[PDB]
Amino acid sequence: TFRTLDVDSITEPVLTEQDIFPIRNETAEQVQAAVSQLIPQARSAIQTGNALQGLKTLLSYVPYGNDVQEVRTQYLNAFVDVLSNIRAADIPAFVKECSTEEIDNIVNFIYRGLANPQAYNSSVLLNWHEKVVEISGIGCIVRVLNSRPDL
Amino acid sequence: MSNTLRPYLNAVRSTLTASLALEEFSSEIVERQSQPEVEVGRSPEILLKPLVVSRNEQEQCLIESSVNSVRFSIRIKQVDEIERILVRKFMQFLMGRAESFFILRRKPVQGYDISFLITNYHTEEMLKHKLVDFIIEFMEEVDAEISEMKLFLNGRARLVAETYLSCF
Amino acid sequence: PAYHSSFLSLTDVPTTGNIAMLPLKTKFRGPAYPADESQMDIIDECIGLFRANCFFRNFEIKGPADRTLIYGTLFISECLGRVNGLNYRDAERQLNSLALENFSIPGSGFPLNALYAPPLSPQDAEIMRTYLTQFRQELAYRLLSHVYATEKDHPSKWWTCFSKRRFMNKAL
Amino acid sequence: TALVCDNGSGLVKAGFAGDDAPRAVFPSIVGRPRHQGVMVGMGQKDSYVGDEAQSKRGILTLKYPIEHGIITNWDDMEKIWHHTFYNELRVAPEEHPTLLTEAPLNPKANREKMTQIMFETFNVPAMYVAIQAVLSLYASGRTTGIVLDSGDGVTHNVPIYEGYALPHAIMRLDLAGRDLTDYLMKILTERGYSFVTTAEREIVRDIKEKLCYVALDFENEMATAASSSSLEKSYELPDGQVITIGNERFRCPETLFQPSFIGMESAGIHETTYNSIMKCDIDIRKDLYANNVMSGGTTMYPGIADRMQKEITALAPSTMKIKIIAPPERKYSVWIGGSILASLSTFQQMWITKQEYDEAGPSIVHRKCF
Amino acid sequence: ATSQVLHILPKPSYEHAFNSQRTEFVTTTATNQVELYEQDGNGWKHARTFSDHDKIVTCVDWAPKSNRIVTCSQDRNAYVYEKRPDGTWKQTLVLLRLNRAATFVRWSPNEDKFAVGSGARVISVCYFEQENDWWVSKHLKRPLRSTILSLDWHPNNVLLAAGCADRKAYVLSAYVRDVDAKPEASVWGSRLPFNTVCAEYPSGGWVHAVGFSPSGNALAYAGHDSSVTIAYPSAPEQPPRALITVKLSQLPLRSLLWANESAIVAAGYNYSPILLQGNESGWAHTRDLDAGTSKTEGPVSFTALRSTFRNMDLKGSSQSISSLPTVHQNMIATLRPYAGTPGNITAFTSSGTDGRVVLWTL
Amino acid sequence: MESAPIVLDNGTGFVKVGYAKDNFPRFQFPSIVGRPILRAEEKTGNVQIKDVMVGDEAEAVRSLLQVKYPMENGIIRDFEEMNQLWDYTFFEKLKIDPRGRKILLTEPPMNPVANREKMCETMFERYGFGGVYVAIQAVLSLYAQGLSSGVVVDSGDGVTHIVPVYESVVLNHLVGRLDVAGRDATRYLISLLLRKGYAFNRTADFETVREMKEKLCYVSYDLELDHKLSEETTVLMRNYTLPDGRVIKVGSERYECPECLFQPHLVGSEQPGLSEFIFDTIQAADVDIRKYLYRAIVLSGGSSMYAGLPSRLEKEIKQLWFERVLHGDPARLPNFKVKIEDAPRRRHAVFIGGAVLADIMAQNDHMWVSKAEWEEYGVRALDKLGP
Ligand SMILES: Nc1ncnc2c1ncn2[C@@H]1O[C@H](COP(=O)(O)OP(=O)(O)OP(=O)(O)O)[C@@H](O)[C@H]1O
Ligand SMILES: Nc1ncnc2c1ncn2[C@@H]1O[C@H](COP(=O)(O)OP(=O)(O)O)[C@@H](O)[C@H]1O
Ligand SMILES: [Mg+2]
Numbered sequence A: 001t002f003r004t005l006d007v008d009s010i011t012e013p014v015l016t017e018q019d020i021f022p023i024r025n026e027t028a029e030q031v032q033a034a035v036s037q038l039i040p041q042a043r044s045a046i047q048t049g050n051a052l053q054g055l056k057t058l059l060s061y062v063p064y065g066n067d068v069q070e071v072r073t074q075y076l077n078a079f080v081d082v083l084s085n086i087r088a089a090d091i092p093a094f095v096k097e098c099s100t101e102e103i104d105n106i107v108n109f110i111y112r113g114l115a116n117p118q119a120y121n122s123s124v125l126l127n128w129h130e131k132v133v134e135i136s137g138i139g140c141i142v143r144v145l146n147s148r149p150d151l
Numbered sequence B: 001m002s003n004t005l006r007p008y009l010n011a012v013r014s015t016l017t018a019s020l021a022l023e024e025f026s027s028e029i030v031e032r033q034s035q036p037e038v039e040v041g042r043s044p045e046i047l048l049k050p051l052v053v054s055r056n057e058q059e060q061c062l063i064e065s066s067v068n069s070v071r072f073s074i075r076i077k078q079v080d081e082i083e084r085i086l087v088r089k090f091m092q093f094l095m096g097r098a099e100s101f102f103i104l105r106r107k108p109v110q111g112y113d114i115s116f117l118i119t120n121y122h123t124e125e126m127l128k129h130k131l132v133d134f135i136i137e138f139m140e141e142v143d144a145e146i147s148e149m150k151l152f153l154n155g156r157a158r159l160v161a162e163t164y165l166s167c168f
Numbered sequence C: 001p002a003y004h005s006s007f008l009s010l011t012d013v014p015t016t017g018n019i020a021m022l023p024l025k026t027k028f029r030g031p032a033y034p035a036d037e038s039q040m041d042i043i044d045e046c047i048g049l050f051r052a053n054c055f056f057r058n059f060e061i062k063g064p065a066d067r068t069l070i071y072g073t074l075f076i077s078e079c080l081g082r083v084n085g086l087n088y089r090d091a092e093r094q095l096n097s098l099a100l101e102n103f104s105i106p107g108s109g110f111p112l113n114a115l116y117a118p119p120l121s122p123q124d125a126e127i128m129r130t131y132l133t134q135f136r137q138e139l140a141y142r143l144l145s146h147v148y149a150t151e152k153d154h155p156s157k158w159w160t161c162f163s164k165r166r167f168m169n170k171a172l
Numbered sequence D: 001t002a003l004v005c006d007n008g009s010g011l012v013k014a015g016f017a018g019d020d021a022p023r024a025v026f027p028s029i030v031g032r033p034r035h036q037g038v039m040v041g042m043g044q045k046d047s048y049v050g051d052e053a054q055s056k057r058g059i060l061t062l063k064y065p066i067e068h069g070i071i072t073n074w075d076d077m078e079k080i081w082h083h084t085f086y087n088e089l090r091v092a093p094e095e096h097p098t099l100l101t102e103a104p105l106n107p108k109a110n111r112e113k114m115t116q117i118m119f120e121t122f123n124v125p126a127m128y129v130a131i132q133a134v135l136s137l138y139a140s141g142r143t144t145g146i147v148l149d150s151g152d153g154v155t156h157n158v159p160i161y162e163g164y165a166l167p168h169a170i171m172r173l174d175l176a177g178r179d180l181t182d183y184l185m186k187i188l189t190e191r192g193y194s195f196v197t198t199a200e201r202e203i204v205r206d207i208k209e210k211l212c213y214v215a216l217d218f219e220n221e222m223a224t225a226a227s228s229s230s231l232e233k234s235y236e237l238p239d240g241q242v243i244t245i246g247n248e249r250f251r252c253p254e255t256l257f258q259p260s261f262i263g264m265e266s267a268g269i270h271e272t273t274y275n276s277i278m279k280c281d282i283d284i285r286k287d288l289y290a291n292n293v294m295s296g297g298t299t300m301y302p303g304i305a306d307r308m309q310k311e312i313t314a315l316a317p318s319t320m321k322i323k324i325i326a327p328p329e330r331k332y333s334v335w336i337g338g339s340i341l342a343s344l345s346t347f348q349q350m351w352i353t354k355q356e357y358d359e360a361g362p363s364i365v366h367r368k369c370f
Numbered sequence E: 001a002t003s004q005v006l007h008i009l010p011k012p013s014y015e016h017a018f019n020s021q022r023t024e025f026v027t028t029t030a031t032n033q034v035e036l037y038e039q040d041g042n043g044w045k046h047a048r049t050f051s052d053h054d055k056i057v058t059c060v061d062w063a064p065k066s067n068r069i070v071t072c073s074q075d076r077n078a079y080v081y082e083k084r085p086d087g088t089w090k091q092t093l094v095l096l097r098l099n100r101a102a103t104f105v106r107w108s109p110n111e112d113k114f115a116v117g118s119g120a121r122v123i124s125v126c127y128f129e130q131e132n133d134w135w136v137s138k139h140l141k142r143p144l145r146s147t148i149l150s151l152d153w154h155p156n157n158v159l160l161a162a163g164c165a166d167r168k169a170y171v172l173s174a175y176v177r178d179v180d181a182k183p184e185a186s187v188w189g190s191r192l193p194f195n196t197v198c199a200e201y202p203s204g205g206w207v208h209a210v211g212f213s214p215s216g217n218a219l220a221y222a223g224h225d226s227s228v229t230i231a232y233p234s235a236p237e238q239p240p241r242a243l244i245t246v247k248l249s250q251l252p253l254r255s256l257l258w259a260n261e262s263a264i265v266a267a268g269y270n271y272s273p274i275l276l277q278g279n280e281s282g283w284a285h286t287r288d289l290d291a292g293t294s295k296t297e298g299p300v301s302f303t304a305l306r307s308t309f310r311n312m313d314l315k316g317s318s319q320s321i322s323s324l325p326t327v328h329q330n331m332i333a334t335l336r337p338y339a340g341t342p343g344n345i346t347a348f349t350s351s352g353t354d355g356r357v358v359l360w361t362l
Numbered sequence F: 001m002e003s004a005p006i007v008l009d010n011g012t013g014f015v016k017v018g019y020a021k022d023n024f025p026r027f028q029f030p031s032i033v034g035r036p037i038l039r040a041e042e043k044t045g046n047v048q049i050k051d052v053m054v055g056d057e058a059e060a061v062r063s064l065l066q067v068k069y070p071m072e073n074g075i076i077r078d079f080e081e082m083n084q085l086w087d088y089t090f091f092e093k094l095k096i097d098p099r100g101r102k103i104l105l106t107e108p109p110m111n112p113v114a115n116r117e118k119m120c121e122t123m124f125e126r127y128g129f130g131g132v133y134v135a136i137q138a139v140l141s142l143y144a145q146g147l148s149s150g151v152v153v154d155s156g157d158g159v160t161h162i163v164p165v166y167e168s169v170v171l172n173h174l175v176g177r178l179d180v181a182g183r184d185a186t187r188y189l190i191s192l193l194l195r196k197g198y199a200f201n202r203t204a205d206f207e208t209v210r211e212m213k214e215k216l217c218y219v220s221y222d223l224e225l226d227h228k229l230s231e232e233t234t235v236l237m238r239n240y241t242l243p244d245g246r247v248i249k250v251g252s253e254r255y256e257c258p259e260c261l262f263q264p265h266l267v268g269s270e271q272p273g274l275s276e277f278i279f280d281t282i283q284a285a286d287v288d289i290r291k292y293l294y295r296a297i298v299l300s301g302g303s304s305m306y307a308g309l310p311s312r313l314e315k316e317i318k319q320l321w322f323e324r325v326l327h328g329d330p331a332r333l334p335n336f337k338v339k340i341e342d343a344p345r346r347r348h349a350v351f352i353g354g355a356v357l358a359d360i361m362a363q364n365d366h367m368w369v370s371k372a373e374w375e376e377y378g379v380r381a382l383d384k385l386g387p
């Protein structure tokens, strides 16, 4: 019977996410190289005990795209490993000196971490969430709700 | 209860309260109608990105959000088979009353134990800070409610044992 | 449904407001035209229908004959309120006193002032009162022949039970 | 909404749940003519009720269908309930639930006939019978206290702690405002004035309601009145002749503190209140002493709260604060608290319903109204 | 900044408009009705309803000089209301030709036309023809891709700004011949025919609010990402001099109003008017106009006795639920001039989902 | 007022009345007649009830009346009550003397001939109209559009009927009745609310559920989506307060009630619903005119006013052409153009088009059936009024 045939999907094509969010102006191998330069700096900053500078350097660029899940998950592995190695007393002094765009990137990537607890320690991500929202306010979560879907 | 749950329920509270910036919005696909857009998904520009808050692999929130509606869904602690039965049936009595708890769904979304739909109309006609207080007070107490139900089940298993075994 | 007046089948009947001044068998003084003593009239009908009609809770009025049957039906409910515990003689004097005492006509505390018309002139009011006083005196006298049919010093319980059966939830 | 009908011994107090005060308040009286009805017509009736009986009283024998909180005449009590619904509130009782009230330690049959007449005569959709002192505690904004309620026919003490009543500690005393009116007739006779008829009993009730008061120390007041004109003052009868009284103004109410004035062998209202607190468990007594709640018209005397506090302070140990709560609206606190209760949402599940009465008979009240 | 609560409406109030003399106001309740309120000493009284719409009224606007009310609804219609000599209002249906709901409406500065935003991917620019006695509608449609959430008119009668759910703020020519005289040359353009596009500015979230500067030389707009962006154009086919975004710490602004050429008031889901100040060198959130941003025994009545037992029964305890510290108890939906010359707004009004109508003095 | 021809849409649920060149009904009121009743209900001295009470006088006061409808399914069921509507319409709504006036009447396309005959007889022999014209209701709804081709579908209280028109020729062999309309949807809402334990069996309560339906019902665009919002969610739930003051809760019944237009089997009919009735009608037209009928599917009448009905109808015709013409091949579906015409005024398009047609023939005195022609030919005078 006719009632179940989807005509709308072919007679009125809906907006795509790239009609809402601008296309990435970098190729997949170009962003994969840019992150592969940063992950070794982020790992090295843990060994010198400077994990705060490990985050400040890792956070200087972020990968996005549905074509880059492998390097997005490698960047998230490094991000959660860096956040797990910062001492909990350093967080308030570091968060107040981040820009609004660095804060937006921190609260975005703690959200990607909280989505996968079998890989990532939620206990440190929730501690970071409490302190980032306490110091920078509710609007940083509002910017994550509104953020791009391929971050 | 909130010493172990405090970091988690603070992240849930903060992001549920950010997510409830709701508005009246009529459908772009149907004329003279409005629908909770998170529940239909037919126009993606007015959907906000779905956020997961999590304590544990077993204890999770999904917050789905839109111009006129939030869907909030939770996985709750079920560490043994008694708790799997007790939780499932408690959520079925609680969702069976959903007309009187106006922000409940009648069914959970798949892979979640209970679910809530807060619409534009609920933020207009109810105190929305008391809606997020009800969500977090439900999440704070449900583990103590379910553990007390397995104490009542233990206490009855003793009642029938002592009644039976004392009439030889 | 409920039972309507057979006298709704009459035509060119005298009228006041929108009561029908129907032919009446009676010995009381007043304006009502003498009925045949051999045939049922509106009071033999009104008492004969009352104890069925007082159970219905819906009634559509066909004309001025039914407006007259309704006023009678409401007055039988008043009589069965007045009559209780009396001897037949005390009941005749009490229910004549009830029939004679000053009552509201339609167009004045009347309970059905939406369904009944006011009197059509200052003189129509006097013919409406002088008809309704004669009618309700006869209606009282006739009812007592039924409620004191088998015994004479106590009203029949088979009639006193309708004393709270308030027709359509209306009373005078 | 629901009706609240505090059908007390001396006044019927009636109205709607959620109203600030009762909108029907009238004598709990049926009057019947005692003289030759000679003029034909004249708007005469077989009997009169409430304010109509009270205004015609010079030609009527007046009687209350309720005495000591018990219905003695059900035919006249139906006449009063009919007057509440159809004349005084102007409602169909078949459209409204009714909250009724009674004093504790009443006959079981009083509750049964009261539920039967409400469902079978007045055709009510639902009803409940509340204890009057439990209602008076809602009107206090309290969930613990001891309520001393005294009406026209009965005085009672009910202690409640955190919403639990202690039913073993409940006291009843069949002495209240009608016994004080009868005693005021007995002692007015000593100064020169005889009041004898059921109509003259309403004149001396009106004297009691505005001349009488409670002395803080009875023997000092009695000596002050025996030695000065200063306690004496006057009242004008319907006949325009004047009554002067002195120690009768505080001797009448003192019968609540000294029941032996009317020949009773009982503790006064102060010591009956203390005996009720002392029947309660030892940990609750402190909060009962701090929450003595006064109610009913027989608590409306000037000085009675100051006297009640003085008398209970002598009985209790000095180590704690006795507090007497006597609101200016305590004339109506049972009705006020009934209008609170009848407007609560859990109470909407506590009603006896028509269907449930029809299935069970009038015994349903004993297994639902406590 | 002083605030005064003028009235509490019984139902939500997404829009209100005062007349020119501030002596009556019109408001959309959340129903198909519109409420007209008159002064009553220092209070207000419900003078009349309008109820010509079938579904929920979304927006309403009152023309200052010509004294006409225009109303829009989810029924896809508009009605214009005009005052009769006897003091009643004449309704007039406008055929908007919209496929979906009307969402937002504004009268033009000369009041000779109005524009209606829609969920239909279009804006109905409506004008009157004396030759036909009709209101007739022109569709702006070229760049618009989603629901139009808000409109504003440039101080010159031609240019229309639009905030859209596609995360963009548009500046479009709504020039209509035999209504408009030719527009003067401007920073937005000079060759300016109907549906020419002067800007397509991006946002981080849905553009709830748009507003031209009092001189028309800049556009402010507010996004659902809790930002206000201020755009300074250069010329046609050329990028802006500055495109300054200030990101707020609070919930999003839904409404927006220039106080002067160097200051903006904005309000929304934060429940509070904020002040932003700046110029083409930079902008900053500078004040909150509501002091409530700082989070700041006797006889007892029957309604307190009864409500404390109803609270014990229905809720956890006797204790009443506290007010929010802001004057508005729910999101503040619209933000409109009340006093001062254009370019120097001295006071403004707000209405909210809590039904409060509130006056603010700067 | 004016000497113009009177136009009367004597519809099954509502009378609408006025004159040639009126842009809207001069009056509109329920086509109801009331008799006095008492019903264990409220009474007051603040009103008076006459032995016949009709239209707005009945509808404002209906708690006090036995309400009856002189019409059902587009035909007069009782001419004695229809005489009381027409007396009210002319003598105390319009406040006119009909003597020698010309009147335009309306009816649906497949009525019994006795309906038009006894209706024209009444105009000539009760009222003494000097001439009559009787128009097919759906061709008037095309005059309101200012339009000469398209398929016009009119759904009122009594009947849903369809009339294809091409280049001003009316395709009389293709016209049809779907015997489901606003009264069947209202009777179905009573049946659906009875499953929820509510009752509406009094003659006065039919107007209460009509107002409830007219306020709260909508057409589901996607049935499995509205069933999901219905069974998984409480968002469809709504409260309605009756004129009693009683409150009722309504949920799935809001989309489930008007679904009987699109699925007539829900009310026991075997006919195809709106979309399939319109498609089977257009698809029976000749190859050269099918495109012009699909490009102008004109909705009319109050039962076309449910929220989402145009959206559902357009979709469901695209979806039915995709099943029955393309056999499920997507490649040609974008090339199929359909346009539902869904004007704001369309509840009154029959009146508004009657007010146009009555002006077009006002000066052409030969176009009307005359009283002098009726009294010499009888019912054969009506043979002027088309095939
Ligand atoms: N907004 C609406 N939503 C749903 N139903 C509506 C709406 N508006 C009107 N109706 C319904 O339409 C019907 C009245 O329409 P209309 O006036 O066109 O019928 P009619 O002309 O009297 O009937 P008919 O043409 O069959 O003789 C009623 O059932 C009414 O409830
Ligand atoms: N001001 C007063 N002073 C003294 N006695 C009063 C006063 N007001 C009322 N009373 C008495 O209280 C009694 C009525 O009180 P009430 O609480 O209504 O009793 P009840 O409920 O039992 O009918 C009567 O004896 C009356 O005279
Ligand atoms: Mg008492």
Ligand SMILES: [Mg+2]
Residues within 6 Å of the ligand: F011, F012, F137, F155, F156, F157, F301, F350
């Ligand atoms: Mg019709």
